[model samples]
Target chain A: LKIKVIGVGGAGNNAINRMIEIGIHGVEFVAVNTDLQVLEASNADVKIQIGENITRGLGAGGRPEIGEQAALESEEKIREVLQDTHMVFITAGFGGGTGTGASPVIAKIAKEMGILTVAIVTTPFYFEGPERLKKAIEGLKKLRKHVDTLIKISNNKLMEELPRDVKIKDAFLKADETLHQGVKGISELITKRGYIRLTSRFARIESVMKDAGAAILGIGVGKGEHRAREAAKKAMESKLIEHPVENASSIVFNITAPSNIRMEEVHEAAMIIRQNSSEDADVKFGLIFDDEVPDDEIRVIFIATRFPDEDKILF
Target chain B: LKIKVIGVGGAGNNAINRMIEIGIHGVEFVAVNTDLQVLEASNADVKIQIGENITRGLGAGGRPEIGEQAALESEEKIREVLQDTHMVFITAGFGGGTGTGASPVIAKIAKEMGILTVAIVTTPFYFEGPERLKKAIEGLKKLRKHVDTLIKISNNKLMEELPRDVKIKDAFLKADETLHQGVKGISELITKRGYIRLTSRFARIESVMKDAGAAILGIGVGKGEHRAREAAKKAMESKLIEHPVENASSIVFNITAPSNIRMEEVHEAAMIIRQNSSEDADVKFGLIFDDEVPDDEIRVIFIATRFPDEDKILF
Candidate 1:
C-alpha cells in the first residue's frame, strides 16, 4: 500500500521528525509547512513549502485564515505530492497558525482524491490561553468535516491525567508519541502481510474507517505465556480510549507478533474484544506476523470509531 | 569508532533484534548464540553460532557451565568477530543458560582486545524462584569482573516500581528499550559529530567508565522553551538511577538536540547536573547536534558510575 504520513505545520513537522528518528517501515513521510525554517529542519521523504506567496516564506502567524490561504495557494503542489497514495495520515497540532489552518485544506483535498484520509490532531493545552483554545476548536471543527476518521487528542485532558510534576516538554512528547503510534498502527494494518492471510483485510479496515467519525486508538503489548489475553485486556483498558467500546459503531484491531504465536492466543485476544465491544458493533481483526517482534511478545493495536460524544469534547 | 553491539545467547539475540527493529544509527549488530534457530531469526550484521560442537546446534539447556564451555570451544571464532572492534556493548538476560554462561567469556575477550566493554544485564524477578536468583547473582559477579563498567537492571525492582496493572511483556519491552537506549546513547556520544567539538570527549567517557565499577543510566527527554533545564531535572530524577548522584564517583552525560539549542540551555542543563553530582565527582558532558531530533526537544542521557549499593540487589 502507498501510505503517506504528512505532517502539517510546526507541530506536524516535529511529529514527522520524531517518527523518522524512531523509524517506521512501509510508509512515506511528507512535511508540509508555510514556514521555511520549519520545512528546512524536517527530515522527511518529501518537503513542501506551502503559502510562500501568502505567508512570504515566514509563517501563518497563529492565524488560521493565513494558514488556510497558504494551503489553497499551494493546492496543486499538495495534490501532486499525494498522487498515487492509497492512504494518507495527516498529523498536526491545532490552535496555532499553520496546522490549524492548513490541515483541513489538505484533508479536504486528500478525501476528494478518493484516498482514505485519517487526521490525528492535538488541541491546545489549558495553559495556552483561551484564544488559542478557541482557535483549536474552530480548526478541529473545520478539519473534522473532511477526514474519513479523526483521532483528537486534548492537551488539557492529557495534562489532567499526568502527574503534577511531569514536565510540559514530556507531556507534548507523549502527545507526539501517541500520534506516531496511531499512524504506525494503521499503516502496518494496511501494509504488512498477514499470518492468517485474508483477502478482506484491507476491505475490513477501510469499511470500518470510512466516514467513521471521532475515532479512539489504543495499543497494548504483552509478553510471557498468557500474552494474548494480557495484551487484549491492556488494549481495552487504555486511557487514550476514554469512551467505552459499547459506544463504538465499528472497531478494527490488528494482532502483531512473531511466528511462534498460537491459535489459542489469537482466540483469547479476540475473545477479550468480543466481551468488551457491543454485540451489534461491526468488528473486524487482522493478524500480522512480524519477525521484528520478539518471540515472546504480542502487540495489539485497537481502533474504534463513531463515538457519541464527538462534539462534546471539540475533538 | 567501530562499535559492535553484541547480543549473546537467546535473551541477548532478542535484544539485538529489538534494537535492529528500532533502528539505531551507526553501529554493527552481532547476534551470538549456540542455537541455530535464534541465529536464523535475528537480523544482525554478523551472526555467530558459538559452541556448535559443545551444544550441537541445540541450546545450553539452562546450564551456565555449558554456555561457558560453548564460548570457550568457539573462542577463535569469537575472537575473529571481535578483531578491530573499538567498543562492544554486550546485552543479555541472566539466570538463563546461554546468556549467563557465554556473556562473561565474550566480555573477557573484548576487554583483552583493549576494547571499551560495557555490559547491560537484567536479573530475574522474585517469582522466578530462589535458584534462578542465585544463578543470576553468580552470573552477574562473573560478568562484572570482566567488564569495565556494568549496568544491572533488576526485574524485581522494576516490577515493584510499576503499577500492578502493567503487562509482563510491556515490562520486559521496557527493559529491552532501556538497554537499546543505553547502547544508542553511548554510541551517539562517541560517534556523532558534536555541536561543541571536544577533543577530550572520548577520553572523558573512557576515564569515567574504565574500571569505574557498577554504573547507573537514565535518559530524560524534554521539549518547549526551557527544555534543557527540564530535561536535566528529569534525567536526575529518573527512577531507574535509584542511587543519588551525590554518591557517584564519576558521572558522564550528553545533551542531544537540534541546531536550535542555545548556549544558555546547555548551561542550564549542566547546572542541574552539577547541583546533583558530588563536589569531587569527575563529571563530563558532551553536546550532540542531531538533525533527527526535533528542534524544540532536548534529551539528556546521564550515566553515573561507582555506586555504593551495587550488591544490594541481584542485578
Candidate 2:
C-alpha cells in the first residue's frame, strides 16, 4: 500500500509523519515541503517519489499550479506504483497550500486512474480566521468530488473530544494518539496472516503512534462478503471488472465488537470471514474506541471505508 | 545497515529523528530504552535496538548484556539481511536507565557476530551534576571493549559554541546545529551506500563523525601521503588501524577543486587498495565552495587516538 500525506508549511510535515508512522515501506517524511532541493532529496525515499515539481516560486502566498503539479506528480507516482500496489491511501488537511490546495488534484488523479482514493481532512481550528476558513472550506468542497471516501475531522472537534487530563495542545495530541492506533490496526489488515496470503500466522501491525506530525487515522472493515467480492465474480461475466478491488475496494466494512466480545465471538468472526469468500479476510477484533461513544454505549468504530484511490481502472 | 536509535524522555524522539533522517533500512526507534517493551515492539522492519544498556537500580550502571540481547534479537529478525546490514551504528546519550546503560551490550553483540558496531555517544552537560556525568562516562567506558570503535561527544561543547553567536540558552541553537549535522552525517554513512561497510570501507569515518559531534564546525582532518600513491594507501591503512571500523567498506574523500593532483595518484591508491584486499572502495570526491589557499588551518582536536572505550580489546 502507498500511503501519502501532503500539505504546505509545517502542517505538511505533520501529515507526512502521521501517515508514515503506521505505514509499511510507506512513509515519506518531508521536513521542508516547500524547499525544492530538500523535497527532491527526500522524495527518493517517499512512497510517491515526488521532487521539484512544486518549487516554482517562494511559497509565502501559495501557488496553486505548483500544488497542482506536485499533486499530479504524486498521482502519477502512485499510478505507476499501482501496477504492483495492493491499495493506496492519502491523508492531508483542508486549510493550506499542500493540504488544502493539492488534495483535490490528487483525488482527481485517483478518480481518473480508477483507483480507490480515500481522504481524511482536517478543518482549521475554531478561530484561525473566516477568510482562511472560507478558503479551507472551498478547498474541501472541491476536493470531496475527487475522493470516493473521506472522513472530515475538525480541529475544534478535537478540542471537544480529547481527554481533559492535559493542556489544550496536549489534548489535541490525544486525538492523534488514538488515530495512530486505529490506522495501525488498519495497516495490520493487509499484513497479517489469513489476511492477504492466508497461510501465515504472524500479524504485521503498523501504528502511527503520536501527534509527531500532521496525520490521519483511517480504518477499513468488512469480510469477503462485501460488494467487492460480488464485483470480482460478476467481472468474470464481461471481463470488464478483472479485479474485485476496482469498484469497491474503498468500501470499508463497519464491524461491531461489543464491550464483552467472547473468544467464541472471535472464532465466530473467523468462521464468517472464512465462509465469505475463497480469498481470506483477516478480521481484527477490538474496540474502535471513539470518544463519542457514551460510557454506557458498547459500539466500536470500524471504518468500513478506505481511501478512494484503490478504485483506479487505468481507462 | 542496521542502525538502532534509542531515545529516552524528550531525547528519545530526537534520537529517532536522527536515525530516520539517515534512512537506515534495518533500523529501530525506541522510547524509554530501559523498558523491555521498547525492544519487544521492535520487529524486523523496525529493530527497536539500543546503544546503551544501563541497569536500573543498584547503580551497576550500563548493562552490556541487555544491549547485546536486544541487538541480537533485532539482528535475528533480519537474518536474511546480513549482507545488506554492512554496519550497525548505535546513537544515544549515555546516562540514566536505558540509553547510557545499554549501548555497550549492543556493541558487544555486534563485535561477537563479526558485525562492525560504532556508537555515537553524548555525555551529559556540566550542569546535569556529577552523578549523571559519572554514570554516563561509565557506560561509555564499558562500551569501548565491545564495538569496533567509539566516539564520545560532550554536550558541553554545544553549550560553549551556542554562546558565541547568541546567548547560551537563548542563543539561536548555533552549536546544536552542527551536532545535528554531524549526527546526521553519521546516520547517512551507515544507512546509505557502502560508505562504512567495514570490509569495504575503513572504520575511521564512523569514529570521526561521532567525535565530530563535539567539535566546532566539525573541523578536523588527517592524511598521510608519502609516495602520492603511498599517501592514499598509508592514509587509508592508518585510518583503519586507528579507528579499525570493524570491516569498513568505503570512505568520503573531500578534495579542493583547484588542488594539483594526478590520476596516477588515484590509480596508485586504487592499486594499493586492490592489493590490501579484494574489497571495492567507494569514494566521493567533493569540492569546497569559494576555494582559498590554506583557508583555515586544520588542527588536531580529539583524535580518540585510542578506542575511546578503553576496555577488553587491543585490536
Candidate 3:
C-alpha cells in the first residue's frame, strides 16, 4: 500500500525530522488549508494557509470550532494533494479554531473516497481548564468513525515524561522519536523474503492533548506473507516506549488479513496485547476484517488505539 | 505590607502543600474560584471567595475562561475576596478554560482596587497549534496591565533545561520550588527591621502564554532606613531570576513607596531597570507613595513579557 504523511506547524517539523531519523523511505507530506489563499510548506509536504478570520493566533480564550473554517479550506487542499495517493495520514489539532473544527470535515471527505486516513493528535494537559479540552473531546468524536485509524498522545503524560533539558526545537522531535521507534520496531511484517513497513507521523495537537498525543499505526496488507499473529506481535513490539495503548482501558482491534487466515491466529496476538498491557487482564476485544484479501496475498495487522477516559479525553 | 499566596488545582495543591516554603509563619493558602458565591474567611483575616468561575480539572480540555462567566457575573465577589488584602499571589493554567479566561479579570480587579496582584502561569509549546497558543498569548495580554506583577514559567524553555526523566510534573515541582526559593528569600525582608511586604492574588489562570508569550513587570514599594539605592538594589536582587526590566521589549513599572521617600530614591531603582534594559526598550513607569513612618514594607517586582510573533512559523 502507498502511504503519505501530513504535518502541521511544530508537529510538521517533528514528523519530517523523525522520518529522517528512522530512515523511513518514500513518503510524501502535504498540507491542506481551505481558507488560506497562499500556500507555504513549513515541513516536507506540509502546507499552511492563514485562516479566514485574519487573526494571528489560534483561539486560546475558547473560540469555538475555529478549525472548522480551516478544515473546510483544508478539504480542497487535501484532495488536491492526495489525488494520486492511495493511503494518506493526517495529524491535526483538536478543538478551538482550526484543527479540531476542520479535521472532521476533511476526514468525512477522505472516508467517502475509500482511502484510509489516520489521525494522530495530542490532548491538552489538566491545567488548561475544561472548555477547549471539552471541545477537543467533541471534535475527536466527530472524526473517529470516518478515519480508519486514530492515535492519541497525552500532553499531560508527555509533560511528565518529556525531558526538561531537551532543546525547544526538539519538542516534537522527541515525541516523534518515540512514535517512529515504535513503528519501526512493531510495524515490520515479513513476507517470504522481504519485509513490509508501517510508519506513523506526529502532528496536529492542542492544549492538554498536546502532551497526550499519538503515533499513527499502519500495516502493508499485501506486502506480507507472515502469520497475522506474528504481524500483530511485530507491530505491538514496535512501540519502544510505553504509550496510550500499553495502558489502555478499552481495546478495539481492526484487521485487514487474507481470508485464509484463521481467527485463532489473530486472537492469539490479541492475547499478546492483553499479556503485555496494563489494560484489563480480561481485555474486551473488538475486531473488524477486510474481505478483499486474495488467497495469494499475505496477511498483516494494523493497530490503532483508544486509551482510558481519564487519561485520553475524547470529545 | 502584607502578602497572600493563592493556588489553583495542581498549583493549588503545590502552593498549600508547600506553604512551609514561603518562609512566613501563619502562612495561608487560599483557593479562589469564579462560581458565584462570595464569603469571607473566618479562620484567617484574609478571604478568597470563589471569586470567578474556577472549576476543577483545567488540566483537562475545558474552557480557558470557564471561571469568567461567574467572575463577570459577580463583581462583588472580587471585592469580597480582595477587600483588605494588601498583596496577592495567584497561580493557574494560562491556556485552559476557567483559569486562563478568568485570571486576567481578577488581576484587573486587584489593580483597580489599588492592591497588588502577582500572577505566575505557564504557556503552551509549538505542538499546541496556533489557535490555542494564540489564546494563551491573549490571556497574558489581557492580564498584563491588570495584575501588578506577572511572571511566566516558560514550559518550553524550562522543559529543555531540565533532565529527560525529570518530566513536566517534576518540572512543575522544580519551577514551583524555584518560585518558593524566591518567596522565601524575599519574605525574609518582612522580618528584617525596615522592609515592607505586599501580596496580591488574582483569579486562577487557565490558559497560558505561548513559548514566546507576553508578560508584565511589577514593582512593590515600601519604606526603610536603608539607603534608597540599597533598597533599589535589594529589590533588583529579589527579582534576579526574572530580570524584569532587563530584557524587556516594553517595561511598565507600577510602584508604591513611602510618602516621605523621595522620587529620587524611586528613580534610583527605575534607572537600574532602564540602564540594565536596552535603550530601545519601551518603558512605562508609574509610581505611588505611602506616608506611614518606621513601617518596614516590602518592595517586590512583577514582570510583564511582550512576546513577539512567531518567526518560528515563518521559517
Candidate 4:
C-alpha cells in the first residue's frame, strides 16, 4: 500500500524526524512546516515549506488563522505530494499555531481525495496555560470533522503519569514515541500480509476505522507461555490510551507472531478483547504468521473506537 | 553490516535527497553542508550543518580552504556520527567549495575511525571553467590519501556520452544515478546473503577495495537466453566507466539471480571477466540466489580496481 505519514509544524516535524531516526520501512514520510528552521532540521522523505509568502519562512506566531492561511496558499503542493497515496497519517501537536491551524486543512484535502485519513495529535500540558488549551480544543473540534479516526494524546495526562523530575525534552520524546508506535502499528496492521483465513484485511481495517472518531491505539509485545493474554492485557491497559475500553462501540485488533503460535493463544487474546468491550460492539481481528518475529513472542495491536465518554477526554 | 551513505555540500545533499526519494533499504543517509539552505532542502536520516561560526550558515563561496575549515570546526560531530558505522560511502561533486573541500576532511575522519571509507565523486563539466577543474584535481589528490576505494565520474566524459539536447538538470540527475547505483550495488554485494560457496563475501570485497585506488563500477541487468553473457558485456562497456577493464589489476563481480539459474550461466559470466582483465588480477566473485529477482533475469555488478593508467582519467 502507498502510505504517507505527514507531520505538520514544529512538534509534528519533530515526531517525523524521530520516526525517521528510528527507521520505519515501506512508508513515505513528509514534514510540513511554516518555519524554515524546523524544516531544515527535519529528516523526512519529503519536506514542504508551507505559506512561504504569508509566513515569510517564519512561524505562525501562535495564530491559527495564519497557519490556516498558509495551508490554503500551499494546498496545491500538498495535494501533489499526497497524490496516489492510499492512506495518510497526519500527526501534529494541538494548541500551537501551525499544527493546530494547518492539520485540519491537510486532513480535509486527504479526505476529499478519497484517502483513508487518520490523525494522531497531542494536546498541550496544563502548565502551558488556559489559552493554549482553549486553542487546542478548538483545533481538535475542527480536526475531528475531517479525519476518519482521530487518536488524541493529552500531554496533561502524560505529565501526571511521569516522574516529577523528568526532563522536559524527555517528556516530549516520550510523547513522540507514542505517535511513532501508533503510526508503526497501524501501518503494519494494514500493510503486512497475513496467513490466516481473512480474505480482505485492508478492507476490514478500512471499514472499522471509517468515521470511527475518537479512537485509542495501544501496542504490546509479550513472550513465554501466557504471551497472548499478557500482550492483550498490556495493550488494553496502555498508558497512552488513558481510558477504559468498556464503552467502545467498535474494536479492531491484530496479532502477529511466529508460525508456531497456537490457535488457543489467538482465541484467548480475542476473548479478552471481546469480554472487555460493550456487548453490542463490532469486533474484528487479524492474524499474521511471520517467521521474522521472535519464536515465543506475540505482538498485539489494539484500537478501540467511538468511546461514549469522548467529550470527557478533551474537557 | 552497518553502512552509512553521507552526502556533502549542495551537490552531495541533492544526490542524497534523490536517493532517499528513490528509497534504498538498510542504510543510513546523512547530509552535511556548510549552507543551511542546502541542508534545509535535504531529506537525509541525519543532517549536520557545518561552519555556523565561520560561514554563518552560508555557502563556502568556491573556497576550498573555507570548506576544509568548516569540516574541521564540525569534526567532533562528524566523528560521533561515524562511530559504530562499519562502512561509509562519501559522495560529492568536486569543483566548488564544500563538496570539494569538506568531503576529503570527512573521508579522513572516517578513515581515522577505522571505517572502510569509499568515495564516489564527480568532476565538474568542462563548461564550468578551467579553474573549477584545477580545484577538482587538487581536491581529489587530497581525497585519495584517505579513501580505500575511490570512484571518480568525470562530468565531461558523461556530457559527451549524453545527447546534446539533454537538460542540464537531467544531466546532473544522470550523474546522481551513477552514484546511487554504485553505492547500491557495492552495498548489496557486501551485505546481501549469497548462496554460492563464497565464504566471507564482505572480507573478499574489502580486500579487493582496501587501498585499491582508482576503481570503476558498472552494473547491468539482462534477461532471456544469453542473459549472463549480455549482462557481463554490458557491465564491461558501461559508459560511466569510460575505460576498458583490461588494465585493471583487481576485479570483483557479483551475479544475483533466481534459484533456477544454471551453473553454466554463472561460469559464462565469470569466464568473460577472467578473459578481459590482467592475467595476475586478484579476481573475486559472489553469487546470490534471491527469489525476488525476476524470472530468467540476471543482474551483474562489476568493479575493476587498481587501474594502471589512472592519471589518464583525470587529466
Candidate 5:
C-alpha cells in the first residue's frame, strides 16, 4: 500500500519497531524522536532526529510545547518523509514530551497531504499518577482532530491482557505486540490480493469506517475440520480490541486461508461472527487464498467499531 | 521470495524483531524460545514455546544441549511451520543455550526442505569471559554445517560503531540494527527488478554464495549529483563487514535508484566499488528502479566474502 509508519518519540518508536520485527513489508518506518539516544534504539527504516537545534539530542524534557516546536522547526524533513506516502500509521505513547507534542503535528502533516492517516497511542499507567494521565488525555484530544482513525489504548489494559509473571519489560512488549497486529490488519486489507476480488465489499467497508469512531480488532487462528469457525471465535477471543462486539455499529471480517477452503466454511464463519454482533451492524467480509498456510488452517481478522468514551476526569 | 524468519532464542528474537520494525515484507516471523514469558514478548507472526517438559518455561539457562533437546522435542511443530518456505533467515545471538543450541537445529530443518537458508548471528562480548567465548565458537561451528550462508557479528564491534555516550541497551540495539541491514541487503537482491533483467547474474551470485565462507555486507545511501559513487563509499563505510574488501574473494553489489537514474550513474558507482576491491574478487552487480526515492538519491548494497576466524579457544 506504499505505507509509512512513523513512530513519534520513545513509546511510538517501540510500537513501530514491533511492527517492523513482524516483517510488515512494502512500507517505510520512520522513527522520529528529539532524543538521539532514544531514537538510536529504534529499528526503523529511517531514523530522524527532529529539532536538532532545539533539543540538541537532549529531548523535550517532559515538555509537550517543545515537542510541538521541534516538529514545526523540522517541518521540511517531516513533509519530505510524508510525501508520496499512500497511508500513514502514527504510533506514540502520549502524556510526555515527544509523543504528546509531536504526534498530533505529524498526524496533521500527513492529513494535509491527503493521506489515509491513523494514530494509535497509549495513555499512561495510573501508577504514573494523575498528572501524566491528565496530560495524556489532553494529547489524545489534540490527536483526534488531525487523524481519520484514532485508537487510544489505556495502559490499564496491559495489566488485564498480559500474564502476571511476565516481567515489566515483557508486559509492555506484549502490549506493543498486540498493537502491531492492529496495524498489520489494516495494511493487509489495503493491498489484499485474491483471485476472486470483491470491489464493492471493500468499498462498503471503507465507506462506513470514515467516521465510525473507535474500533475493536481481533485476530484468530483455527485448525482442523471446523477451522473457519474456530478462527472466528479465537479472533474475538484475542481481545486485543477492548470494545464490545455487540455494540459495534460496523464490522469488517477478512478470512485468509488456503485455496482449498470451501464457500460453506467461509459462510459458516461469517454467520458465527454475525451471531455475536447486532444484526443491524454494517458487516462486510473478504476472502483471500494464501498458499503459505496449510489446507487445514485458516486465519480470521475481525475489526468492529463503537462510539468513543465521553467520560471526563472523576473522583 | 516468500521467506520465513525464525528467531531461535533471546538474541535471535531481538534481531528478528529489529528487521520486522524495519518493515521487511513478504516474510513470516516465527519466534522460538523455551521461556513462555519471554516468547510472549516477541512480535513474530507465530510464537512457538518448546521444551515445556524440560525447561518448563524456565529457559535454557545457558545450556546449549538443553536448547538442542528442546528443539528436538518440538520437531513436528518446527517442521510444520517451516513448510512452503522458499528461503529462510535464521537470526540469533549465539553462545547462550537457546540461540547457540536451537539455531543450527532450525537451519538443518530448512536445509532438509532444500530451501535456501541463511543464518545471521552475534558472538558474545569479550567481557562475557573466555569460557562463554569458547562455547560460542563451538556453537558457530555447529551452525556452519546446516546453513547455506552464515554471517557472524561480534559484540565487541558495538563499541566502535555506536556513539560513546550510548547506553548498553542502545549499543546492543544498534548492533542488531546493523545485522538487519545485512539481512535486508540479501533479501532485496533475490527479487530485485529493473529495466534490464539479470536472471543469470542473480543465479551466478547465488551459485558462488553457497557455503562461501563468512561473507561481508555493506549498505550505503547517497544524495545529489555524485550520489551513486557516494552511496558505494558510504555502504562500505557502514562497515558491518569485518573482512577486508580488498581481500574479498567474491562480491555482489545491488543498486536501487529512481527510474530517471541514468545508466552512466550506475556504471560510475560500480566503477567506484571495483576500484576499492581486489582484482581477484569475482564481482556481480544487479540494478532495480525504486520510484519512491527522489531522482537525486541512490542506495547501494555490497556483499563480499572471505572465511571466518580459525583460531583456537585455548587460553
Candidate 6:
C-alpha cells in the first residue's frame, strides 16, 4: 500500500499543499520544482529544486525544454529519492515548463524500475491561451510514453464547470482540490485497513489499468447502514466520472466501510455495481474496514477506463 | 429547523431520492408530478398527481401552458398540503412536462403563505435541443417572480461538465446530485446541533434574502481541529458559488461543529470569511453543534447574492 506522491512543478507543489491541508495522510510526499521560491514554500517531506544550473534557481520560465533539461541533469537525485519505490503518483499542472518537462522524465525513470506509474495531471485553463494548451498537449504525449495510467484532467473543464465570475485563485484552488480528492481516494483504497482491503489486489489493478488506458475516477460518501446502495449509486454518478460506466472496458471498484457494516450491505453494493457494468467489462473489486470512518458511513472509489473508442486518443 | 422539501415533476422526484439517498435529514418531503406512471414510482412521504384531468393523468407533454392549466386545477390541493409550511424548497428540472409546469405553481402558493420560498431548479441541457431550451428559458421567468431566492442551476453546466460520451441518464443524475448538495448544505445550517446552535438567525436570513435577489450557495467539509481555515477556503472554492465572494452584497454564513469545538476555532472561521468578503456587505452568521459531526469535523454552508442584473437570463 506504500506509494510515492511527487509534486512536479508550481501546480504540483500547490496540489501537495492541498492534499496535506485536507488530510490525505499516510503517504510519503516529495515536492520537485524548478523554482526555488516554490520549493521553499512546499510542506512536503522532501523538496528538490532541479535544473538549478540551467535556470539559476529561478524557474523554467514556461519553457518545457528547459524543464526537461533540468530534470535530465538532476535524474540522479530523482532516482536516489525513489530508489525503492514500487508505485509512484506524478502530479503536476501541465503546460508550464517544469511540470510538463520534468514529469515525463520522472515517470520515465519510474518505468525503468518496472514500477506502477500514474500521472494525475491538469492541462492549462482555456483562458491560459492556446499556446500553453498546445504545450500541455505536447507534454501529455511525452508523458504518456512512460506512465502506465495518465489521468489527464482538463483545467478548462474545471473553469467551464465553475461560475463565470469566480476569482482566478479560487478557480485554481478548486482544480487543486480535485487533484487532492483523487489522491485521497487512491490512498484510502490502498492504505486503510478495512474488511476487504484493496491493496492486496493492486496487481489486478495494474494489469487491467494498462489495458484500460487513461481512466476516470469516481468518489462518493454515504451515511447510515443503508448507505451501501447509495454509495454505489453516487460513485457511478460522480461529476468527475465523465465516461459511462456501462461502456467502460475495465473497472477497479473499491469500497471502505465502518466496523458495523454487514455482509448483506457489502453484497448489495457489489450486486448493484455488477448490474450496471458492461457484459464484457473487466471489473475488479476491493474492500477495506476502518473505525475512523464515522458510525454509519461508507466511502466508495472506482477508476474505470477502456472507454469505448477512446484508446486511439489516449496516447 | 424543520423544512418541507417538495419535488415537482419527474426531475424533482429524482432529486428527492438523491437527498434521501445522501442522508439530508430533518425535513418533510412531498412529490407532485402530473404524470401517473411517474408518480407511482415516487418514494416521498406525500405524493400528489396534479393536472390529472387536464392531461388525463398523462403529463404536461412539453407544454408549460398546459402545466399552468393543471396547477390552476389543483391550486387548492397544493395550498392545503403546504398550509403549515413556513419555509420550503421547490425542486424541479425545467423543459418538460410536470417539473417545468408544476414547480412555480407550488412556489406561488408558498409565497402567498408568507413562506420563505427557495427554488432549486435546473435549465435544459443543450442536447435536449433549442426548443426545449427555449421552453426552459420561459419557465425560468415565470418561476423567478414567485420565489424569494431562486438558486438557479444550469443543466448546460452539467453537460459542459461531464465527458462528451457520458450517457444522458448519468448526466441528469449528476445534475441531481448538485441539487442534493445544495439542499444538504442548507439542512446542515438549520438542523444540526453544535456548540453554538444557529436556528435563531433564520429570521435575519429571510430579511436580507429578498433584497439579495437570487443567491448562490457554497458548501464545504473539513476534518481535525485545525479545519476552520481550510473549511473557509473550500466554501469559497465551491462551483455553486461561481461569483466572487467580494461581489456578493449579502452573506448568510453558517457553521456546524462538534460539541468539543473551541471558541478560538469559531472566531478563526469568521475571521477568514470576513477577510474574503466585501467591506460593505451585510454578513449574517449562524452556528450549530451536532454529535453526528465527528469530534474533529466541521461543516460550513454560506449563501450569497446580488441578482437583479442576472434576472433576465436564468436559462
Scored by TM-score, the top model is 6
Task: State which docking tier applies to candidate 5.
Answer: incorrect
**Candidate 2 chain B — worst ten consecutive residues by lDDT sum?**
B210-219
Candidate 3 C-alpha lDDT tens digits along B1-315: 455666543343354445554455423555554322222212223444443333432232345555555456656756676777665666665665546766777767776876656666666644556676667777776765576445454455556657877755687776566445434322322222211111101000101111213233222345555445454454444431223345556544433343334333554666666555668866544333332323355343433344353112111
Candidate order by TM-score, highest to lowest? 6, 1, 4, 5, 3, 2
Better of 1 and 3 by DockQ: 1
In angstroms, the error of model 1 at A150 is: 0.5
Off by over 4 Å in 3: A9-17, A20-23, A33-41, A46-64, A93-96, A127-129, A163-172, A179-315, B1-315
RMSD of each: 24.6, 34.2, 34.8, 33.9, 32.1, 25.9
Q: Is the docking of candidate 2 incorrect, acceptable, medium or high quality?
A: incorrect
| TM-score of model 5 (CA atoms) | 0.34
Question: What TM-scores do the predictions have?
Answer: 0.35, 0.29, 0.29, 0.34, 0.34, 0.35
By DockQ thresholds, what CAPRI class is model 3? incorrect
Worst 10 residues of 2 chain A by lDDT: A198-207
Q: Write the per-residue lDDT of candidate 2 for residues B1-315, one digit (tens) a residue.
A: 344444432233345554456444435543334354444443223433333333331222344345444444444433433334434555566655456555665556555666545455667767778887887766766776565534444666556544444544442133234334434433432232211111111122232322221111111232444234444443344321323422333333322211223223434444544454324433332222111223231111111112233221111
Clashes of each: 1, 60, 128, 0, 7, 11
CA shift of A265, model 1, Å: 16
Question: What's the CA error at residue B256 for candidate 3, in Å?
Answer: 68
Rank the models by lDDT, top first. Answer: 4, 1, 6, 5, 3, 2
Per-chain TM-score of candidate 3, chain B? 0.51
* Native interface contact recovery, model 1: 0.00
Quote the lDDT for B311 in model 6: 29
Model 6 regions more than 4 Å off:
A1-315, B194-315
**CAPRI tier of model 1:** incorrect
lDDT of 5 by residue, A192-288 (tens): 2212212223233335443343345456789999999999987765432333577766676767676456545776797788778888876766544
Q: After superposition, how far is residue B133 of candidate 3 from its true place, in Å?
A: 90
Tens digits of lDDT, candidate 4, B18-37: 88898775789999999998
Please give the C-alpha DockQ score of model 5. Answer: 0.01
